[PDB]
Amino acid sequence: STTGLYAPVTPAGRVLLDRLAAHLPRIRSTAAEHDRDGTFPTDTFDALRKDGLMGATVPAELGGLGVDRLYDVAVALLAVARADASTALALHMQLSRGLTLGYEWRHGDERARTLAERILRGMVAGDAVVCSGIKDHHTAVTTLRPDGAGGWLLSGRKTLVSMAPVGTHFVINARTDGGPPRLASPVVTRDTPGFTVLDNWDGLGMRASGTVDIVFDDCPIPADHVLMRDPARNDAVLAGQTVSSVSVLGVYVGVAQAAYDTAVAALERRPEPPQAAALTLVAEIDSRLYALRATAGSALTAADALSADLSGDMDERGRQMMRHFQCAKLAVNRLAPEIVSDCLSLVGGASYTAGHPLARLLRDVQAGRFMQPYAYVDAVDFLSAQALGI
Amino acid sequence: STTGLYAPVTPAGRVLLDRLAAHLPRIRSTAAEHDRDGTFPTDTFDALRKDGLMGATVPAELGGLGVDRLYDVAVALLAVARADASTALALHMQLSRGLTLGYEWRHGDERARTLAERILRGMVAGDAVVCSGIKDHHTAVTTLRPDGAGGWLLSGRKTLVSMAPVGTHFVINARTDGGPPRLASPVVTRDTPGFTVLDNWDGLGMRASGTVDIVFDDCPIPADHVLMRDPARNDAVLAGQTVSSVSVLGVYVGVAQAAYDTAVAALERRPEPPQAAALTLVAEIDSRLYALRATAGSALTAADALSADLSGDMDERGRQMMRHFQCAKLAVNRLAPEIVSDCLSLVGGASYTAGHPLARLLRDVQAGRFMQPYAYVDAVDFLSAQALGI
Amino acid sequence: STTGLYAPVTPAGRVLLDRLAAHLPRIRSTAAEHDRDGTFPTDTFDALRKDGLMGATVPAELGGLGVDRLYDVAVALLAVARADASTALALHMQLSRGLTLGYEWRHGDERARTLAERILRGMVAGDAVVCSGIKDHHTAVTTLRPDGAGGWLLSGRKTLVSMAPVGTHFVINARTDGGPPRLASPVVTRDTPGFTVLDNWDGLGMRASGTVDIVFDDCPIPADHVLMRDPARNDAVLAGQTVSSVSVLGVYVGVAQAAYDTAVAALERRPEPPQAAALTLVAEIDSRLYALRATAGSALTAADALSADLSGDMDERGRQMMRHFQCAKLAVNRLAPEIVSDCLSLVGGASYTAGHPLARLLRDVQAGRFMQPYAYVDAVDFLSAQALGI
Amino acid sequence: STTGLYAPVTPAGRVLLDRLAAHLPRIRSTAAEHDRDGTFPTDTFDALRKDGLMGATVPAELGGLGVDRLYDVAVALLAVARADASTALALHMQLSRGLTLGYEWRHGDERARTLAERILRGMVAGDAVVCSGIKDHHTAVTTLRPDGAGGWLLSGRKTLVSMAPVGTHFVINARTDGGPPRLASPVVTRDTPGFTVLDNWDGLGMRASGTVDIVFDDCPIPADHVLMRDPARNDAVLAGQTVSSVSVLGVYVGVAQAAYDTAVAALERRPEPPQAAALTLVAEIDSRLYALRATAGSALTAADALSADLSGDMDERGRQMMRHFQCAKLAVNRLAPEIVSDCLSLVGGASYTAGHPLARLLRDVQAGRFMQPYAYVDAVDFLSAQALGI
């Protein structure tokens, strides 16, 4: 199978999915409690760490499983999400960081490569859990200031940092302010002075994903723990943002799958044969889920092809990767919640009590809409700009 | 204004809405806490009781405000629901019971009239809070058994009984089992032996509505506290079920209104002018909300006209009332959640944290789908049967 | 019945609908031929003229039937449209002109009143068939130029002028160019020199509606055949544009009704009982048609109420009338074509051959989308401007 | 590119698409006239015949181009459909017959192989144009009767036979009636006595596709021109029906593409920058078209994989092929017409006149809904049966 995210397409992808199977039963078992209490499943992550799955996307050269297709990462996230979407969303941050650090390792200058290499062997060993602090909190602009002696001091606050509760290393999007301002990616470790992880995530869904705020109060960062980016429009950069986020589409596809599976099981348990409207819903969902899978799957296949090809116009490459990502994302964010919603009509009133799985899937399935890049309102400006050559 | 539920159409309806205004600020203020904890707002109901609003739909002959249009009851529920939908849903059970007891009073035999009259002056006084126990729990069929001395013993369990926590009187749908079986409406009071109110409502939404189970363990009911119904298809009965439930459409209309109002306020608070997709969403919502209001409003106007006219074929009357109700209900249950959902796209990520009002409106707005009569799957069998003359 | 356009709400409205019934059978009978050939049904209009129905909306003071509610005009258009939508669309231009000329008659200065009065008794007599030339063709800006002796010369070209083939009088939106420019409504009669009616309408639907272009080549117009308007934003003018166009919503409602009626008749003719998907479609359509009727009906009731009340802020009055019109129009233009489309799924492949009635209804039902004011793209700018107080 | 039908995936597929390019300009040029008059473009087909493209899917062993992927056939149909959908729909019947005859040739008994081989070299040479007469007209059940001397006589009538006007050979689905009844595929040639091609296709769309009825009045068919099928449920047969029809999804995808391309060109031609609603429509269409392509493309890739694998349970193989086909078909038949419809909103009123390309695309895009297998109502019974293991 090379379509619909039905199966991994490479040998490493298969091993990844086989190894994950052992962990599914714990993931499913504790999901309801962590959602109710809003707490991160630290024990699931301890098991994945010692089992080496936290290094799944580290290059085999460095001792990792060598998963290097986005498509296979999404197939694994989908399987995890059918068990618990919060765990999948947190796992995606680790897996996709494996992929972009792997590219720094192979194409960065010596500073990037050395640093990337250290983190990547960390990930395999179980010692490095890598979170991404991307979006500034509204009270703050996260800035790096020279320390006077050749290093830096980082101040600010980032929001919505998933997996933060077990994070050991945090890649932070910041700008300088000591040249003219440049974008920089300092890496802060958890024991850096001035560094606090807050405990303030209270989600409608993704309740267990640890999607908290992190605060930097003059955190000393040494020069070789900073990847300087640039200044300045640069489309080629869209490619890294795609690699960073596109596989997360597997999460919302798995949520829709688990809703459908729940609804069908419910219908089969009944003495009465399904009513006319239930048969029609089932057929409509079956086809919508197919179109959901085919759309995520194809944009993932296309993204993997463009990702592997470095031989051309890098700006065109980044626009094309982002256009595949965004076209598919908008479709996913409309289809997945529609499917989940229609599933509640099949099960009926039992799905409206707080503990039923569908009631949680209805909350978790909404989270994709708000994840940048891009939320709906911004996606429409991006897409119409690209389509009309603005 | 005679359309869209924009304003009450009778003098008593206006008084009702004016008097409710005093209570809105407490209702809005405590909504978040009661949703979080899942607890019934007993203090709001204490205030409505002593203010006489719990008698709003009692005939003026008996000292009530004399609200007798469904349309005006829905206009009042809408205003309450913009403050808190759980409170509105519970209030609807009291108000619509005012209307069906008022019909028992004017058209019942002497047993019904006497009993109805006692309860109705109760409601005005603040002493009677009347809940409806309609749907059997799956473990039980609620049955009335003769006690050997001319009275009855009631056993069973009813589910989803809103307002039960403050209920003093419970109208219960039961069947006999001492003739051949008949449908009977015994009225049980809270201090009857064998009668328990459970504390088991844990909703995805409508969390504060007190929608709990109630249990009957050989509850002694005297003969004059039982309204015997019949055996046996009887379409005329559809009219009472319509009167009982149709005004609750105002609840879901108010939820959609409060979502839109929230979204618009959010857009106006921003320094930036809205993006192209936000302007288009606003226009689409504005028109969808209009169609939502016009559909609920017209079915309520039509229901009031048919309700008042007793001069014809009573079976045709009941089919027509139920057809207006069900056509409008299906539209309401698709339009209202769509509006609320689109509102989250306007506000963006802040609406996905557990405390934001939209996150609660998204949960509460789903409840209409599951309320009988009829849930989606059964509505489709009813409607296609009527349209095709089956 | 006061809702859903199910029945006229005034005695004159009832007479109008009763009198129209005689003409329905010819209208239905010739519809297919006129659609195929693209030709205007001149014989239907000859019959309506001599029967006096072309004066239905002329004040009884002047010998007309005195229909003065938009709601009743829409109920009559709906009945005509179930027979043929092109005939209804052309009839709407006559009927609504009855209403706006009736307002000129009662509130214009002596020039307007005298002219309005002459035309209105024309309409009753069968001698005046009044078309509206509103939109400039792209090659031309229709301008009135003083003739040097106290009258005017009209040049330009208007497009999409329905009913033009039998039109005797044409109210034309023009601007002066002899003060500073003003808007003017010259009335041109068919025998004016320089005046040509073209024969260039080739519609996907509304094929028989005579929606042709008309050309003015220095047409001499006397001063008392010109209603001068103003210069300059003026919201009060929205009220006349609403009166002019809002009742045409009945046309698209009748098209949806005739599609549903066709589909249901088709299902009842079959030996087999309907499949599960057909029962579900029937219920969905039944409810969508209800919401369609309730939305058009309520905006028509609201428009009639605001129309009759001249006692207040005239600018607020015009914004409110247009907002009711536009909210309802957007809903109508999405719901009506959806219903018609779903009807083809019920009938199946027979509805895809050129002669089946549904194939024509699918074409005619699209025309509302393109009629100003406002087409979809402009409606969204109007509605979001009003909702956000821009 | 291996997704979205953006490009053929094999060398023969590329040659096919390159060779077709020469013919596109005539196809586009004559489309409007053939739609207006309802006439088959015999000259386009004469050119494809002599150019050998009518043999594109004949095995290279027999002198054909050897196109053997459904995916590449759909990529070619899409390119043709952007020029004219009727021509594509007719071409699909020839191309897919290349594929199922190619399977008879390689896996049939000697009767099938010999006959298949003769026809297939015909197709390459330009001498054989192969139509499929599948669906019985309602007045007739098409039956083969033994002629008493070892051959057969064919009577009946088939409907909706596309390409019939230039057809030289007609594969007919029939049942015997001389054992117990069996299904048989007699092949009738155009000069057989008793064989008439009628001239009765009058479509809302696909007007030029020659989709006429054909009549058999005791047509003598020799025994070696009959492929006997079986009696009796047999799921394995679903695989041939899939191969026969699945590539036609490319037709409706090309129609949606040509609508979008038209709309975008229209927006770019305007002096004014697009309004807020137009930008939002453009982004929504861009994403819907992506999901349309990804869904058709993936079901075509999956169908090609299952088609090539003959090594397993043949009944499971046929259920899986048909399930991919039907899931995708239902999505295509909702997405493609929605896109085309939204395109008319972008262009506005010009798209409602009979000659504008969008007005034709709106008609042609509806045809997929009615093509078996399966039309919507039957697809829902098939899909819900498969999903619920009925």
Ligand SMILES: Cc1cn([C@H]2C[C@H](O)[C@@H](COP(=O)(O)OP(=O)(O)O)O2)c(=O)[nH]c1=O
């Ligand atoms: C350009 C490019 C970058 N990357 C990786 C290397 C960088 O670490 C990373 C940048 O990702 P991200 O942080 O999402 O981009 P930004 O810095 O714009 O927020 O992406 C790829 O994996 N592939 C690529 O083609």
Ligand SMILES: Cc1cn([C@H]2C[C@H](O)[C@@H](COP(=O)(O)OP(=O)(O)O)O2)c(=O)[nH]c1=O
């Ligand atoms: C027949 C009818 C009943 N009613 C009232 C009187 C009865 O108390 C009540 C029955 O309502 P309900 O309990 O909803 O009906 P059922 O007994 O079928 O569950 O409805 C009306 O208000 N109007 C009517 O026309």
Ligand SMILES: Cc1cn([C@H]2C[C@H](O)[C@@H](COP(=O)(O)OP(=O)(O)O)O2)c(=O)[nH]c1=O
């Ligand atoms: C202001 C107003 C005008 N009218 C009528 C009188 C004018 O003849 C007519 C103007 O309609 P119309 O031609 O649609 O407006 P415009 O001149 O802006 O195109 O509307 C009403 O019927 N009611 C009103 O309240």
Ligand SMILES: Cc1cn([C@H]2C[C@H](O)[C@@H](COP(=O)(O)OP(=O)(O)O)O2)c(=O)[nH]c1=O
């Ligand atoms: C079983 C099978 C048949 N075919 C071809 C061989 C037969 O000629 C043809 C039957 O197609 P079709 O006529 O669509 O099936 P039916 O006879 O049920 O109408 O399909 C394949 O191409 N692949 C297959 O796997």
